[PDB]
Design a protein around this ligand. Structure first.
Ligand code: 42T
Ligand code: MG
Lengths: 69, 103, 502, 1340
């Protein structure tokens, strides 16, 4: 279901937004989860260019530079 | 919590009085251009003596005797050069740029 | 320590001298209002404003009105920098003193910084992306924001005191983003479906409707004219009536060649109004499109076809012209609404009485026991419903075709020129449902339980409602407002779950 | 007829005569507080009551008792006006006599000593003004009446949703006025349960045991007895013939040598009748029938002394044998039926963990206060202190009443605590409902809904104060010495004072009166709320309670209620509605005896109204008032239908009572849909008063009552002739019949002049009477804001045309001519109170001195020597009202600034400019200035000038009082002396002062002269004391806040007329915002050349269905018609005859109306005035549902010279050509709500910022920027704008660096951003890291 599928998000910062914050922070912190951003909501929170729209030319030219030479 | 039961809470309304306004911050940056051009107006030694007698673009500032030892010319001498310097920046067309800075 | 970290999981410790439980670090992080972390609930933003909104039909659809003072306070830094860039102000300080004194020289500088600089406009219930749109500022004397009528559909904004907010696209990238994306002219089509959201609204469609339409007989009936020019010239001089059946020569284009406009001329059988309106219709659109009665649907399909043929720019200018002419001719039309504009069926009382005989028929049957209680209930409710249908389809036929007028002969009858009808038929406003409640009896109401009362409202709004009828209507009203106000929230929650999942 | 009715009369259509006329609309408010504070020599609600409840307070066993004697409320420290100006609270000292007695230890009871401490002071309590308002801090406030669930017992269903078995459930709830709740509820297994409050669920019988009921007695209470006899051998049974109903024969039923029923034959009415007449008491039964039967009582073996079977235990075939050989004859069992009488309590016992009383009390005490070890005295004390303690519990009168009534009892009044019989009876009722006899009540019904009010709630808060003072009294009476302390040292002030102050000051029900408007006040004072303390919340109660119930009829207005988060959670009180004796809602009716409709009034509550069949307000009856139809629409129980001619018990009093005063002001309401009507009556309260109070051209006839009953106007206390008329005051000479023998006297009215109103609008009164005019008692002597000649004008009528005008009217938008803004009719006056605070900072005190660093001569010009703006000086934005300067020393400048100062030789002041300056953009005139000074700090120059001035003005006022009063008194002595003593010319010669010596012949007139002497001297000294007191009140320093030395309040009167962006609406729920102001040149006009004021949009009419606004137009037009004609005939100056003729003709209007008419009026000097007032238009009254009809309006149009269609030809003011088709033109009454655009409009570039998180925040009244929310963010996300979003949530707002670094670039001419990280997330990092969580930022 939509409300169920919304629960699963790689980025934990994103999950801390619309879900129960208290649980999310812990449940992520135990596994030492590493949020790479890559999504809209997270980049909105952290206050940098959205990985879409105009910013798609940014995050792209970045994303490929990452995990590479 | 203040009224409306909303997320409005007391501290949310406490304004920062310790910050400075940008409207003034642009003037603080602008004065540094003004005194710079105006100091470019005087003689190099009058400019040195004036930049020295005040903390202008330098660490702290300097006593008149201090300005004396640094110039090799000392005492009352410098104190005179200052006055005439202030005198050259006193009457308009030197002053007209700076005079607009005092509200 | 626990109370410090997350309070409320043991004892809920209380703050000094105050009953209210002290806010711990967990509450600091979590925030409030369900789940809202400030980048969610909202954030205050500089370089902004807001106010009550007004119409401004004179505006092109790519622009809008903004209050002088507002634009001054909004663009203040730009105004300072531009003031001292030209040399009108010694230093930034003096610039502030100048705009503070509001010297006469600053208005022109403001006109400079405003010119190519777009602004963002927004409404309170933001749903679809069209909830925020970019416009070119036009300096206006007043405290009110002027908003182009065609866009009033996208915002879902009425003129009843709705407020709009304005934001300034500071950085260059924001200016170009606003102009090439958030711009009004760049969204003419709803993202949900390819149908135009710039569709004309009410007054304008009443204008274009009143224009193209034909009464049986009127000035210049049956004459011939060379082109739309002398058709309009015929109309304005008072020689010919706006609506009359007339043959006129027109030149229509078809781009059906390869990337190329074909030209053909012909004598079309049309009306004076349609001829006048044809002047606006750009290029390759065929005359057929304006030869009809021009309802809201048709007037929309006009814009649609025009966009899928000529492209963006011609569609934009076309739409603008349509709005202007709509307003002008609707104004000239003298359309109004009186108490006699709403016509009740002459046969109403008879239908009422017959359907009222049925109820005593079934009543007598229940008295003699020929029918059960519930079955009786169903029977009476059925007969009253059928009655409502009868009166409805009575007043509808009457109010619709009753106009009986003479051309050169004895008689003939066409669709009515009555105001309220034209309004409901064109799609400007009102509908058969509400018109039904104005003339004919309105429905049957249902108690909060949902059990539908077997004594419907016999009267209507044109007539008086008595104490009972109104009391009985009140519940319907309250449940209406409550249900709608609830479904707004439900919609919000749904959109929330949706954006969260996508 | 009255005297202002001769000034102007309203033409009234409608038929139904008003049998009962609208009462005082402020009734409820005044009555409540009238009951709260009062001396009641019994337990009836009041301060006396609440006193008697907690008192007498005795110590713990120590025999030191403190008892309450009597109380008094001292005269107010400041009167209404003074207290309003100064800003203190309008209140009275509460002085209460307390008697402290100490019993000599080791009674017989007698006191060593009893000190009666004289009236110890506890708290001051607020007072309600004659207008039903309170003043908390210098501000009129109202306490809204509350609507809650009435105390007593209530039986509900909770079918459906629970368990989804469809079996439903049945629960009872006992809700006391104060004290813990008592709940009973069933479950799916039919085991009866009980819970105190919302607490843990316990098996029902567990409470019974706590009342000391053994199992045997519980069974004996809830079940009947089936007697088994072992006569001879092999059993028998006692049989009541009715017992066999609803059951099938389990065996052969035979007795008396005759077989009545066989096996497998269900016992019907036949078998039962046969058994009844043959009278079979005893039958023989098998030993197996008792296999399922439950034994009533305990049974023991007489020999062995051992328990054979416990009470409530299932018998077996063997147990029978074991108790039979023991010599047992009789066996009692429960009478049980799964249909008729249910076996619930038995199984309830089967779930009961306890056994005896102590055990039950243990489980209960461990239920209420769990986890702590129980004690005998603890459980006992708890259980006794829950429902049985006079202290901790009560239902009061309404509670005990509804309780007993719902239990089908006799006694209407009883104890304030529960009894065993009570709880038991309730349980019995619940069991009966589960058994099928009896029904469940509903909450929504107004019989279960109780209405409180100011007095009652204030009584409750004062009660809390008294209990918290009780604890202290006992606490101190613990260790106390004998004859040293008295009832002073114990009882404090602040505890009670803050207890009442917290209520009036901050409560959801206590709010600021909405005074923008005479309708607003009066409709606020009549209001109901389901919110607040002792009520539900918007987040809790569902659609049911919000929704309209048939019981709302005549009690609560269906169409008046706020549309928003709380709908129907407020409503309003209806027109003729009243608070019931017990506090319910009752509405007037007309008793119909036999076939006649009597004019006798009868009030029926929600429950009273239930069975009776009530007729209709709209019904046809004639002559004796007999029903014309053989059947008429009526309503009896919950429903409405056609009713037989005479079945009818009652009838509606008026065609109004269904609605409220707000709705009753809506003309042609019957023609409007309920939604738009609701919106209309909602906005009607928002109308800001105009400059010129006008009049409704289209009325109702309620607008007179609203204007008069609300305190906005000034009504004559007594009738007479006006001696003096001023814009300031009005002095009326009293008629003798109304006049009291002593003091003689004349009534002096001091009119309120221009002053601040709660909404910042203007409140000002103007005299409606001229010099030397006859005035009737209870007649308007002057009008308040938005009132005209005794009526209510909330706005101004004007010429309206329906037609689209160039799309300028587009949605609701309104196109208004320049004629309106020029005539200054819709102009409004705002009174804003601005304050200047002189505080104390550690750097030094702040001065109000006129000496201000960095200001021009023009800046210090408008200020006096002391630094305060002159009275009357007109000011705009930026002007300095009050010069104020606060110390800030050692500015700590920088090098370039230092060089600057060295060149320009300027001393940078040690003082900073805090001066109060007029808010930006607003402009007005100063109408007043006040200076509040700490008592003991020297008053400055200006403040002294003002003080002296006020002193002089006071002396002048008082002297005027004494002069008019004395002359008025001696003028009576002159008249009385002439009777028996008469000398005309001789008397007035000698000095007036010496008149008191002259006597008179023996008579009562001598004693009258004596009276006049006594009262004369009384006045003479009263003047003295009043002058003294006034002077002292002027000179005394008002007590201020900590740190503030002095305060200067400047009163600005701004005048704003109208501009695009303002909101305007009719009474019909049609809103609009003025779009453009169009010249009189472009205005559509008629053949006569008269332009139109306002052009509306016809398209708004059909969709939202309000057709009334059109009717209102039509009649309006016609009304104005009758005016214009008269306006010509007055300009023609015909004569009294022609005029009078036309006016009468107008007031008659065809046939069958209730108005009546003139030529009882003086044919010359009177009529010509009425005609003079009618020339503006002819005021018409359209009753709510009794209002006018189309034919009547068309007829009036005929009389008017104007067309039937109400439509005329109109020409464009531009082209001059005619508009095709006719357009509807007329006069629609239109208001101006205060949404005014120069309020709403806001703009911000770079303002202040919040400290905790750096975000834009207005601190200066310079507004914080708009809030960019999640949805707006999504809107940006949908487009491709990343940079707009980033700049939105980073540089423009949250970035402490980015904002300034941006600003410099904006002024430099570079548009970029260097975003950085928002401070929000940056703080989140610290908050997270403050926990045991390490949050880091990786890579690069
Ligand atoms: O309210 C009920 N019926 C109900 C009946 C009617 C009605 N006639 C009425 C007309 C005027 C006044 C009262 C009743 N019908 O002909 C109207 C309503 C109304 F709310 F819409 F105004 C409700 N039933 C009811 C009862 Cl009796 C108890 C509790 C709940 C309900 Cl929903
Ligand atoms: Mg709206």
């Amino acid at each position: 279901g939509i409300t169920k599928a919304s629960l699963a998000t790689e980025s934990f910062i994103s999950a801390a937004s619309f879900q129960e914050t208290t649980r999310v922070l812990t449940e992520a912190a135990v596994a030492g989860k590493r949020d790479e951003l890559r999504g809209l909501k997270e980049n909105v929170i952290v206050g940098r260019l959205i990985p879409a729209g105009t910013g798609y030319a940014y995050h792209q030219d970045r994303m490929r530079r990452r995990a590479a030479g | 919590p203040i009224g409306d039961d909303e997320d409005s809470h007391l501290g949310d309304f406490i304004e920062d009085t310790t910050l400075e306004l940008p409207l003034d911050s642009a003037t603080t940056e602008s004065l540094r251009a003004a005194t710079h051009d105006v100091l470019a107006g005087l003689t190099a030694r009058e400019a040195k003596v004036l930049r020295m007698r005040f903390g202008i673009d330098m660490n702290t500032d300097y006593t008149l005797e201090e300005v004396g030892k640094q110039f090799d010319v000392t005492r009352e001498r410098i104190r005179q050069i200052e006055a005439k310097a202030l005198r050259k920046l006193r009457h308009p067309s030197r002053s007209e740029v700076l005079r607009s800075f005092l509200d | 320590v626990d109370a410090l970290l997350d309070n409320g999981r043991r004892g809920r410790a209380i703050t000094g001298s105050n009953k209210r439980p002290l806010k711990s670090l967990a509450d600091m992080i979590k925030g409030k209002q369900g789940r809202f972390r400030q980048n969610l609930l909202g954030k205050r933003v500089d370089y902004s404003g807001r106010s009550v909104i007004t119409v401004g039909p004179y505006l092109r659809l790519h622009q809008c009105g903004l209050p002088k003072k507002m634009a001054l306070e909004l663009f203040k830094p730009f105004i300072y920098g531009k003031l001292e860039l030209r040399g009108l102000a010694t230093t930034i300080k003096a610039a502030k003193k100048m705009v503070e004194r509001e010297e006469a020289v600053v208005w022109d500088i403001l006109d400079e910084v405003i010119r190519e600089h777009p602004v963002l406009l927004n409404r309170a219930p933001t749903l679809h992306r069209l909830g925020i749109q970019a416009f070119e500022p036009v300096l206006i004397e007043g405290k009110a924001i002027q908003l182009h009528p065609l866009v009033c559909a996208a915002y879902n904004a009425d003129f009843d005191g709705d407020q709009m907010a304005v934001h300034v696209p500071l950085t260059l990238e924001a200016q170009l983003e606003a102009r090439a994306l958030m711009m009004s002219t760049n969204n003419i089509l709803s993202p949900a479906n390819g149908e135009p959201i710039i569709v004309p609204s009410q007054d304008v469609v009443l204008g274009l409707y009143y224009m193209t339409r034909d009464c049986v007989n009127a000035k210049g009936e049956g004459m011939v004219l060379t082109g739309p020019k002398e058709a309009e010239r015929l109309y304005r001089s008072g020689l010919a009536s706006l609506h009359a059946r007339v043959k006129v020569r027109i030149t229509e284009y078809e781009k059906d060649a390869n990337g190329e406009l074909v030209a053909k001329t012909s004598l079309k059988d049309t009306t004076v109004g349609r001829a006048i309106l044809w002047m606006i219709v750009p290029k390759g659109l065929p005359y057929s499109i304006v030869n009809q009665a021009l309802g809201k649907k048709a007037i929309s399909k006009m814009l649609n076809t025009c966009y899928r043929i000529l492209g963006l720019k011609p569609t934009v200018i076309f739409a603008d012209q349509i709005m202007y002419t709509g307003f002008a001719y609707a104004a000239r039309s003298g359309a109004s609404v009186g108490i006699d504009d709403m016509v009740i069926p002459e046969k109403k009382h008879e239908i009422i009485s017959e359907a009222e005989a049925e109820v005593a028929e079934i009543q007598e049957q229940f008295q003699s026991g020929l029918v059960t209680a519930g079955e009786r209930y169903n029977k009476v409710i059925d007969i009253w419903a059928a009655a409502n249908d009868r009166v409805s389809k009575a007043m509808m036929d009457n109010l619709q075709t009753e106009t009986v007028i003479n051309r050169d002969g004895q008689e003939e009858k066409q669709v009515s020129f009555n105001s309220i009808y034209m309004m409901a038929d064109s799609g400007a406003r009102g509908s058969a449902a509400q018109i039904r409640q104005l003339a004919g009896m309105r429905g049957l109401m249902a108690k909060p339980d949902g059990s539908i009362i077997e004594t419907p409202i016999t009267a209507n709004f044109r007539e008086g409602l008595n104490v009972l009828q109104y009391f009985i209507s009140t519940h319907g009203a309250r449940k209406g407002l409550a249900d709608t106000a609830l479904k707004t929230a439900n919609s919000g929650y749904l959109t929330r779950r949706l954006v969260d999942v996508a | 007829y009255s005297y202002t009715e001769k000034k102007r009369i309203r033409k009234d259509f409608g038929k139904r005569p008003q049998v009962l006329d609208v009462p005082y609309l402020l009734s409820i408010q005044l009555d409540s507080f009238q009951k709260f504070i009062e001396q009641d020599p019994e337990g009836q609600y009041g301060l006396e009551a609440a006193f008697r409840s907690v008192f007498p307070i005795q110590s713990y066993s120590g025999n030191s008792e403190l008892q309450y004697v009597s109380y008094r409320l001292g005269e107010p420290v400041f009167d209404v006006q003074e207290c309003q100006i100064r800003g203190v609270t309008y209140s009275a000292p509460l002085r209460v006599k307390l008697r402290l007695v100490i019993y000599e230890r080791e009674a017989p009871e007698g006191t060593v000593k009893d000190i009666k401490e004289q009236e110890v002071y506890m708290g001051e309590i607020p007072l309600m003004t004659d207008n039903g308002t309170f003043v908390i801090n210098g501000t009129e406030r109202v306490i809204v009446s509350q609507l809650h669930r009435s105390p007593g017992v209530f039986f509900d269903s909770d079918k459906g949703k629970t368990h989804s078995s469809g079996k439903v459930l049945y629960n009872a709830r006992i809700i006391p006025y104060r004290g813990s709740w008592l709940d009973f509820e069933f479950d799916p297994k039919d085991n009866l349960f009980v819970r105190i409050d919302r607490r843990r669920k316990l098996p029902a019988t567990i409470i019974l045991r706590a009342l000391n009921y053994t199992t045997e007695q519980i069974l004996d209470l809830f079940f009947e007895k089936v007697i088994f006899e072992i006569r001879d051998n092999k059993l028998q049974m006692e049989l009541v013939p009715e017992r066999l109903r609803g059951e099938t024969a389990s065996f052969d039923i035979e007795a008396n040598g005759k077989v009545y029923v066989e096996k497998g034959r269900r016992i019907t009415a036949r078998h039962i009748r046969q058994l009844e007449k043959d009278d079979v008491k005893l039958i023989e039964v098998p030993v197996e029938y008792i296999a399922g039967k439950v034994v009533a009582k305990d049974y023991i073996d007489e020999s062995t002394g051992e328990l054979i079977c416990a009470a409530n235990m299932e018998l077996s075939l063997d147990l029978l044998a074991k108790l039979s050989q023991s010599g047992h004859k009789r066996i009692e069992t429960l009478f049980t039926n799964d249909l008729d009488h249910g076996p619930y309590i038995s199984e309830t016992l089967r779930v009961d963990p306890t056994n005896d009383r102590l055990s039950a009390l243990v489980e209960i005490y461990r239920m209420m206060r769990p986890g702590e070890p129980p004690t005998r005295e603890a459980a006992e004390s708890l259980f006794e202190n829950l429902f049985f303690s006079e202290d901790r519990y009560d239902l009061s009168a309404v509670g005990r009443m509804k309780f007993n009534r719902s239990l089908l009892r006799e006694e209407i009044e009883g104890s304030g605590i529960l009894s065993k019989d009570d709880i038991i009876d309730v349980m019995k009722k619940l069991i009966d409902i589960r058994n099928g006899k009896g029904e469940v009540d509903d909450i929504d019904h107004l019989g279960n809904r109780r209405i409180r009010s100011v007095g009652e709630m204030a009584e409750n808060q004062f009660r809390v104060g008294l209990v918290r003072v009780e604890r202290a009294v006992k606490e101190r009476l613990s260790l106390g010495d004998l004859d040293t302390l008295m009832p002073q040292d114990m009882i404090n002030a602040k505890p009670i004072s803050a207890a009442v102050k917290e209520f009036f000051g901050s409560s959801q029900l206590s709010q600021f009166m909405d005074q923008n408007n005479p309708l607003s006040e009066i409709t606020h004072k009549r209001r109901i709320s389901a919110l607040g303390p002792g009520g539900l919340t918007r987040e809790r109660a569902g659609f049911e309670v919000r929704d309209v119930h048939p019981t709302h009829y005549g009690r609560v207005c269906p169409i008046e209620t706020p549309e928003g988060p709380n709908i129907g959670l407020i409503n309003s009180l209806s027109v003729y509605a009243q608070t019931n004796e017990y506090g319910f809602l009752e509405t007037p009716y007309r008793k119909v005896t036999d076939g006649v409709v009597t004019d006798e009034i009868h009030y029926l509550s929600a429950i009273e109204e239930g069975n009776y069949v009530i007729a209709q307000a709209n019904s046809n009856l004639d002559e004796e008032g007999h029903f014309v139809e053989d059947l008429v629409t009526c309503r009896s129980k919950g429903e409405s239908s056609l009713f037989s001619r005479d079945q009818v018990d009652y009838m509606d009093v008026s065609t109004q009572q269904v609605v409220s005063v707000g709705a009753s002001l809506i003309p042609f309401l019957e023609h409007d849909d309920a939604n738009r009507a609701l919106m209309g009556a909602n906005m009607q309260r928002q109308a800001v008063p105009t400059l010129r109070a006008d009049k409704p051209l289209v009325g109702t006839g309620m607008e007179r009552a609203v204007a008069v009953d609300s305190g906005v106007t000034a009504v004559a206390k007594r009738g007479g002739v006006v001696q003096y008329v001023d814009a300031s005051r009005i002095v009326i000479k009293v008629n003798e019949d109304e006049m009291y023998p002593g003091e003689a006297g004349i009534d002096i009215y001091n009119l309120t002049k221009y002053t601040r109103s709660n909404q910042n609008t203007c409140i000002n009164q103007m005299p409606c009477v001229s010099l030397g005019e006859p005035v009737e008692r209870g007649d308007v002597l002057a009008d308040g804001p938005s009132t005209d000649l005794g009526e209510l004008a909330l706005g101004q009528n004007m010429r309206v045309a329906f037609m689209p005008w160039n799309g300028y009217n587009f949605e609701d938008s309104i196109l208004v001519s320049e004629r309106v803004v020029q005539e200054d009719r819709f102009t409004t006056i705002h009174i804003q109170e601005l304050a200047c605070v002189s505080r104390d900072t550690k750097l030094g005190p702040e001065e109000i001195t006129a000496d201000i660093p960095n200001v021009g001569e023009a800046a210090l010009s408008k200020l006096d020597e002391s630094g305060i703006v002159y009275i009357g000086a007109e000011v705009t934005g930026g002007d300095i009202l009050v010069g104020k300067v606060t110390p800030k020393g050692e500015t700590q400048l920088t090098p370039e600034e230092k060089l600057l100062r060295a060149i320009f030789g300027e001393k940078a002041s040690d003082v900073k400019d805090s001066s109060l300056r007029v808010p930006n953009g607003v402009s007005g005139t100063v109408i007043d200035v006040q200076v509040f000074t700490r008592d003991g700090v020297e008053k400055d120059k200006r403040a002294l000038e003002i003080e002296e001035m006020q002193l002089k003005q006071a002396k002048k006022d008082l002297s005027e009082e004494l002069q008019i009063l004395e002359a008025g008194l001696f003028s009576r002595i002159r008249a009385v002396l002439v009777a028996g003593g008469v000398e005309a010319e001789k008397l007035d010669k000698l000095p007036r002062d010496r008149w008191l010596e002259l006597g008179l012949t023996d008579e009562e007139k001598q004693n009258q002269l004596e009276q006049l002497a006594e009262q004369y001297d009384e006045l003479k000294h009263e003047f003295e004391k009043k002058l003294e007191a006034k002077r002292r009140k002027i000179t005394q320093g008002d007590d201020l806040a900590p740190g503030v030395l002095k305060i200067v309040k400047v009163y600005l009167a701004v005048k704003r007329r109208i501009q695009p962006g303002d909101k305007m609406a009719g009474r019909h729920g049609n809103k609009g915002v003025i779009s453009k102001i169009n010249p009189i040149e472009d205005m559509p006009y008629d053949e006569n050349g008269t332009p139109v004021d306002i052009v509306l949009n016809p398209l708004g009419v059909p969709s939202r269905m309000n057709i009334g606004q059109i009717l209102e137009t039509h009649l309006g037009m016609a009304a104005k018609g009758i005016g214009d004609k008269i306006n010509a005939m007055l300009k023609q100056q015909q004569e009294v005859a022609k005029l009078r003729e036309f006016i009468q003709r107008a007031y008659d209007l065809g046939a069958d109306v209730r108005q009546k008419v003139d030529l009882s009026t003086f044919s010359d000097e009177e009529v010509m005035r009425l005609a003079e007032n009618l020339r503006k238009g002819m005021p018409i009254a359209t009753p709510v549902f009794d209002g006018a009809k189309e034919a009547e309006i068309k007829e009036l149009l005929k009389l008017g010279d104007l067309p039937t269609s109400g439509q005329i030809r109109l020409y464009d003011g531009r082209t001059g050509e005619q508009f095709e088709r006719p357009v509807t033109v007329g006069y629609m009454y239109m208001l101006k709500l205060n949404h005014l655009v120069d309020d709403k409009m806001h703009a911000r570039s770079t303002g202040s910022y919040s400290l905790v998180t750096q975000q834009p925040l207005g601190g200066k009244a310079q507004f914080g920027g708009q809030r960019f929310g999640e949805m707006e963010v999504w809107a940006l996300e949908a487009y491709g704008a990343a940079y707009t979003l980033q700049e939105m949530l980073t540089v423009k707002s949250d970035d402490v660096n980015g904002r300034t670094k941006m600003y410099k670039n904006i002024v430099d001419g570079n548009h970029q951003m260097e975003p950085g990280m928002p401070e929000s997330f940056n703080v989140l990092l610290k908050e997270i890291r403050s926990l045991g969580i390490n949050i880091e930022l990786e890579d690069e």
